[PDB]
Design an enzyme around this catalytic site. Structure first.
Site, PDB file in Angstrom:
ATOM      1  N   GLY A  20       0.799  -1.192   0.000  1.00 27.63           N
ATOM      2  CA  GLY A  20       0.000   0.000   0.000  1.00 27.63           C
ATOM      3  C   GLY A  20       0.839   1.251   0.000  1.00 27.63           C
ATOM      4  N   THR A  21       0.119   2.370   0.060  1.00 29.10           N
ATOM      5  CA  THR A  21       0.682   3.700   0.203  1.00 29.10           C
ATOM      6  C   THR A  21       1.155   3.870   1.640  1.00 29.10           C
ATOM      7  OG1 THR A  21      -1.655   4.452   0.288  1.00 29.10           O
ATOM      8  CG2 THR A  21      -0.389   5.010  -1.723  1.00 29.10           C
ATOM      9  N   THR A  22       2.155   4.719   1.825  1.00 28.05           N
ATOM     10  CA  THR A  22       2.592   5.091   3.170  1.00 28.05           C
ATOM     11  C   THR A  22       1.483   5.897   3.879  1.00 28.05           C
ATOM     12  OG1 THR A  22       4.871   5.236   2.266  1.00 28.05           O
ATOM     13  CG2 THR A  22       4.503   6.178   4.436  1.00 28.05           C
TER      14      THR A  22
END
Lengths: 236, 244, 72, 231, 241, 242
Positions: free
Chosen positions: F28-30
């Site tokens: 995923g995204t941070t």
């Protein structure tokens, strides 16, 4: 629960229909011959084993209506289930539509039990094939239908299902004609007796005959009658 | 693998059982269909298997309603479910509106039944495990676009066609349609065209106890032609093969 | 880098060629410069037409058309 | 086949593989290109027939007089999502007196797809929708993944050869956003985007279907000679 | 042969699935030690504070089921919260429908029956927590009943849980050899905490902080936890003995 | 073996499928969450994968009740489905008890649900980590919820790819402030560690989105940090990594 007991095939088939027809094959033999004034369903009876009380033993031809008869081949367990269900259908045509059932209605109904189990999951189609025959009320036209465990039906002039149906089918090619069916009750009956004496053989003890005559006449021909036709045909 | 589940995506990226459905049309007795602006004709192969068969009570022609006709080809265990549903749908429209149902709308409803594979996908009730195995040639006349012919897949997809042939001999039929379809056909010239394409994919003697023609006409309604008319048309085709 | 070795048309632009390939790698681009010269010899032309570079992409992708479609 | 026959297993790679297969339905399918400006959104779909005897099948479904969707993937999967979108859109008008917000319809749609991917005996639907509409926040162009995910863009495409369409739209990106109030220009630029999505499929007038929605322009699908003015 | 995948018996007369549940409680590494006092039951348990970015006050393994019944949980923390919630729900049910707070003996049995039903379903996996219930009832006195993921429970003079709990069992057993009674006689609840900590220290060979422990004490008709300052006083008193 | 479902269990005391799902969150995204004295400042990396995207219009931040921000990483649809479920739960609490749902209470309800799908074979395990918290009468709270269905209180939390850069600097942040920082200060510190966590996502480029719920800035309601103040933080963070 709806965990498919009927599922699609890579040949574009359904597995349970292929297996069902072979289950109909290994079962008993039914011949249906229709005259111009009768229908006759004569069927193979397993009473080979002795000490069987043939009288109280279930029949291969069961009347559903006072002029609509049904005979069966395949599993003997499954057929009786259908025969209870058909009896409900018979009273339902009377209930909402008055008049006893037409042959054609009852043919679509048996097939509609099969159809149900064909598309849905958690069910599998009965391995049962039938020869449905009879009169519609105020008709003296014989009707001869066939149902198969797919949920498909076919009209016939003559048909045979069961074991060595091909031998019997070929025999009726050379006797029976679509053009001019037998013009007599007895001639029809004797042609069905003659076909059964090929494969089923073994007297009137394994051979049965049921006759329906037009407009509410169901009569059953006892063992003795069946035996007299047997000896005459044998001699001839 | 991908055939043990009635809702699974495969390492091609589209359903495998659905492919098998397309390969269950190739087990059906050919149904051929030519649409023109003078009416649409549907012909079907009945297929005789024995002279013990009663074939003039068997047909793959079906009435959905007065103004819509249908021919089915493929597994006919499946087609019984779909035709009964088509019959209700038409009658429901006429209940609700006192009006004729469009051929496109009627077909679209039958495609909604065709998409009912799965047993745990979406919200809508699943009454099947798999797809059907039958395609339809729903012809008709509505007063909006006139005469119409639709070909409906067991996929749950439909196309409007001018001519379509489904069944076992479908590819060999479809080759003849490309070269023989034109806009200046007539009702009767279309009717002879059906039998021409049917004769090649017929495995027997083309006659009137193993072929059935039917029309859908505005002013006559849906009429299923009697075997007398079929026999006549068949003979006149042989006279146009006596021209070559 | 392949077209360095071979005679080619000068009316081709390597950016046009870069539009019409989507997710290709160098082995396939070997299969487009060589495929240009197959089309070229078949016409009967000494040079390798600038139309032949575009037509080696479609003729040889790594597969012949995009597969069956029957409801997509 | 280890996890590829199942829709309920991970997947040591942190995927579900069913989602990638549902994506290949877009690749085999038709192509559609969407681009929007502030005052207009535009869908240009490439309709597809089966053969010449076959007419082309509508790939744009009108959801409302301010909303439309387009399919690029399988049609029966589209048939589930399209009904649900239409129902929730009439519902918004009925209960809340509200034109259904395009963004919010995307989020309801996302979670719907998800719960059939969660369930065993389900799938992720193999249709990508580009959903346009003009609501109270202006124009929108959404991207619907098979997973469910919605992303908002000034220009996107799905189908086969979609990559080249997005190259075109990134070039002309600031051109078409700054033509506003002229529906004619956005349509013309979408024709050129989907011309880079041909493999000699050719644009004719019965292949080509355009639909637009404006600030004041209803959602209307043009075909026939109403797309012949934009070729 | 799937007798390790679904909850059916093998030819060894054992459910493997069920055994695997016991092998998860040793993986989180929480030890507990529980002794019955003379007016209290005391349970001290490890608190693992791994990082500086966990807040230790919200790190819990002691759930307060009822007013008088604490529960300490050994094994994974997802299953711990599901069990704690269920246990609470049934206890409130019991007060509601029978008009008095649920006893500890009966609470052990109720959770034991649901855990057995979770080893009888093949689509519901049992919860892999071993649950200790500590109380002082006024119908059974100070009590400990320990339930397990199989659905078995039994009463205890004292009990331990965790991977190194065999080591704890030895110390406790010696203590009850000398007294020759099944509970510690000491009327101050505080000094029963101090004894409990002594037996834990012997077993694990580790000295503890206030934030390495989390302590629950059931006195007569109330269950509370000690705060971190109060735990340090107890650990200061270990040296005073 | 021992991953074919989640009613399989291994002799290792692990569930494999569930550990595998944590790897989806790693893709995923941070996303980060800083627990402050008087609130929480969440920040999430929104990648710009194309200039086709529309900035600050695709939220990964959905509010629950009015005072609980929820932001996540991993599979975006699955987390939006998780938050849809919990918005129904928030409403039920407000119905019955006529008060907004507390942060410990909201956590418990979400945890049971995610915990349930790792027992049933009829429903697929989650693949989301959500970072959620807010301000109620019991203080500021911060919670991180695993797809295994675990949560704890946190003084700092992170999930996503670029949690490697984020987590370390939160150890220095506690070490800066062992009694935390102001809500004001945390605007510029939530921005700063997305820009340092843009070095695990330095293939691409990104858009900063920031939101907060704090007593002293918004009054314990979850609001979006927007306008000139969002842009002030972006200017701060931008200078640190340069």
């Amino acid at each position: 629960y709806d965990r498919a007991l009927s599922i699609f095939s890579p040949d574009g088939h359904i597995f349970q229909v292929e297996y069902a027809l072979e289950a109909v094959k290994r079962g008993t033999c039914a011949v249906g011959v229709k005259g111009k004034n009768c229908v006759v369903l004569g069927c193979e009876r397993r009473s080979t084993l002795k000490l069987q009380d043939t009288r109280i033993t279930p029949s291969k031809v069961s009347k559903i209506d006072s002029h609509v008869v049904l005979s069966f081949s395949g599993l003997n367990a499954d057929s009786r289930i259908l025969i209870e269900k058909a009896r409900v259908e018979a009273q339902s045509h009377r209930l909402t539509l008055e008049d006893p059932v037409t042959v054609e209605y009852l043919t679509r109904y048996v097939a509609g039990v099969q159809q149900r189990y064909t598309q849905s999951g958690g069910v599998r189609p009965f391995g049962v094939s039938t020869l449905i025959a009879g009169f519609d009320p105020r008709d003296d036209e014989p009707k001869l239908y066939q149902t198969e465990p797919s949920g498909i039906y076919s009209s016939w002039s003559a048909q045979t299902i069961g074991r060595n149906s091909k031998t019997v089918r070929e025999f009726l090619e050379k006797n029976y004609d679509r053009k001019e069916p037998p013009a007599t009750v007895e001639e029809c009956v004797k042609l069905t007796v003659r076909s059964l004496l090929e494969v089923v053989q073994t007297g009137a003890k394994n051979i049965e005959i049921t006759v329906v005559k037009p407009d509410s006449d169901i009569v059953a021909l006892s063992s003795e009658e069946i035996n007299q036709y047997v000896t005459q045909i044998e001699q001839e | 693998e991908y055939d043990r589940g009635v809702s699974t995506f495969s390492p091609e990226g589209r359903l495998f059982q659905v492919e098998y459905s397309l390969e269950a049309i190739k087990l059906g007795s050919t149904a051929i269909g030519i649409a023109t602006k003078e009416g649409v004709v549907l012909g079907v192969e009945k297929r005789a298997t024995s002279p013990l068969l009663e074939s003039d009570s068997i047909e793959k022609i079906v009435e959905i309603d007065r103004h819509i006709g249908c021919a089915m080809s493929g597994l006919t265990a499946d087609a019984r479910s779909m035709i009964e549903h088509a019959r209700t749908a038409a009658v429901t429209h006429n209940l609700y509106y006192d009006e004729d149902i469009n051929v496109e709308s009627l077909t679209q409803s039958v495609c909604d039944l065709a998409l009912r594979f799965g047993e745990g996908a979406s919200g809508e009730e699943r009454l099947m495990s798999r797809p059907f195995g039958v395609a339809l040639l729903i012809a008709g006349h509505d007063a909006d676009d006139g005469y119409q012919l639709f070909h409906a897949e067991p996929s749950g997809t439909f196309y409007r066609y001018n001519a379509k042939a489904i069944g076992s001999g479908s590819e060999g039929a479809q080759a003849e349609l490309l070269n023989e379809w034109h806009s200046s056909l007539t009702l009767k010239e279309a009717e002879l065209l059906v039998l021409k394409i049917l004769k090649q994919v017929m495995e027997e003697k083309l006659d009137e106890n193993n072929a059935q023609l039917s029309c859908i006409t505005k002013q006559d309604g849906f009429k299923i032609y009697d075997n007398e008319k079929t026999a006549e048309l068949i003979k006149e085709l042989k006279e146009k093969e006596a021209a070559e | 880098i392949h077209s360095r070795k071979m005679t080619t048309d000068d009316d081709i632009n390597w950016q046009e060629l870069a539009r019409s390939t989507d997710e290709f790698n160098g082995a396939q681009l070997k299969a487009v410069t060589v495929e240009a010269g197959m089309i070229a010899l078949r016409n009967g032309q000494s040079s390798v037409k600038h139309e032949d570079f575009v037509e080696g992409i479609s003729e040889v992708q790594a597969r012949k058309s995009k597969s069956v479609s029957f409801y997509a | 086949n280890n996890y590829d026959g199942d829709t309920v297993t991970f997947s040591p790679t942190g995927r579900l593989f069913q989602v990638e297969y549902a994506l290949e339905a877009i690749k085999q399918g038709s192509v559609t290109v969407g681009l929007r400006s502030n005052t207009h959104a535009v869908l240009v779909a490439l309709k597809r027939n089966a053969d010449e005897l076959s007419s082309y099948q509508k790939k744009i479904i009108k959801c409302d007089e301010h909303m439309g969707l387009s399919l690029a993937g399988l049609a029966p999967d589209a048939r589930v999502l399209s009904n649900y979108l239409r129902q929730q859109c009439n519902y918004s008008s009925l209960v809340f007196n509200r034109k259904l917000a395009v963004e919010r319809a995307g989020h309801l749609l996302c979670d719907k797809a998800q719960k059939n991917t969660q369930s065993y005996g389900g799938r992720p639907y193999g249709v990508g929708l580009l959903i346009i509409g003009y609501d109270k926040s202006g124009a929108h162009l959404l991207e619907f993944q098979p997973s469910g995910n919605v992303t908002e863009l000034y220009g996107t495409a799905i189908g086969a050869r979609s990559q080249g369409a997005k190259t075109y739209l990134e070039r002309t990106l600031d051109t078409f956003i700054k033509i506003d109030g002229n529906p004619d220009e956005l349509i013309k630029a979408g024709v050129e985007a989907i011309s880079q999505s041909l493999r000699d499929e050719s644009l004719t007038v019965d292949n080509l279907s355009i639909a637009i929605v404006g600030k004041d322009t209803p959602f209307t699908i043009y075909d026939g000679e109403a797309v012949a003015k934009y070729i | 042969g799937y007798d390790r995948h679904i909850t059916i018996f093998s030819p060894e007369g054992r459910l493997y699935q069920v055994e695997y549940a016991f092998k998860a409680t040793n993986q989180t590494n929480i030890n507990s030690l529980a002794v019955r006092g003379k007016d209290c039951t005391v349970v001290i348990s490890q608190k693992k504070v791994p990082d500086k970015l966990l807040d230790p006050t919200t790190v819990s393994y002691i759930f307060c089921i009822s007013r008088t019944i604490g529960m300490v949980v050994n094994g994974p923390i997802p299953d711990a919260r599901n069990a704690a919630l269920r246990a609470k729900a049934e206890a409130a049910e019991f007060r509601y429908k029978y008009g008095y707070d649920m006893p500890c003996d009966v609470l052990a049995k109720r959770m034991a029956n649901l855990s057995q039903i979770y080893t009888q379903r093949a689509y519901m996996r049992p919860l892999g927590v071993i649950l200790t219930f500590v109380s002082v009832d006024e119908e059974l006195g100070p009590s400990i009943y320990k339930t397990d993921p199989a659905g078995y429970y039994v009463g205890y003079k004292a009990t331990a849980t965790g991977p190194k709990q065999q080591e704890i069992t030895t110390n406790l057993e010696n203590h009850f050899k000398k007294s020759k009674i099944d509970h510690i006689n000491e009327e101050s609840w505080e000094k029963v905490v101090e004894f409990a900590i002594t037996h834990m220290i012997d077993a694990l060979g580790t000295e503890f902080s206030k934030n390495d422990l989390e302590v629950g004490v059931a006195t007569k008709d109330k269950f509370f936890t000690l705060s971190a300052e109060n735990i340090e006083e107890r650990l200061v008193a270990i040296a005073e003995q | 073996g021992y991953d074919l479902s989640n009613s399989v269990f291994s002799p290792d005391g692990r569930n494999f499928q569930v550990e595998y799902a944590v790897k989806a969150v790693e893709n995923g995204t941070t996303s980060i969450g800083i627990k402050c004295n008087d609130g929480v400042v969440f920040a999430v990396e929104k990648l710009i994968t194309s200039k086709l995207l529309v900035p600050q219009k695709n939220v990964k931040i959905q509010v629950v009740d009015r005072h609980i921000g929820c932001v996540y990483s991993g599979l975006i649809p699955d987390g939006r489905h998780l938050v849809n479920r919990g918005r129904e739960e928030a409403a039920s609490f407000k119905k019955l008890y006529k008060t907004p749902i507390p942060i410990p209470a909201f956590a418990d309800r979400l945890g049971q649900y995610v915990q349930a799908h790792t027992l049933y074979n009829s429903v697929r395990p989650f693949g989301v980590s959500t970072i959620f918290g807010g301000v109620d009468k019991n203080g500021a709270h911060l919670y991180m919820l695993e797809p295994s269905g675990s949560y704890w209180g946190y003084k700092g939390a992170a999930t996503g790819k670029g949690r490697q850069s984020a987590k370390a600097e939160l150890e220095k942040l506690v070490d800066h402030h062992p009694e935390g920082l102001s809500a004001r200060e945390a605007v510029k510190q939530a921005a700063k560690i997305i820009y340092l966590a843009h070095e695990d996502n330095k293939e691409k480029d990104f858009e900063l989105e920031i939101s907060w719920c704090s007593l002293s800035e918004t009054n314990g309601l979850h609001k979006f940090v927007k306008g000139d103040l969002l842009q002030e933080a972006i200017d701060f963070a931008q200078k640190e990594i340069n």
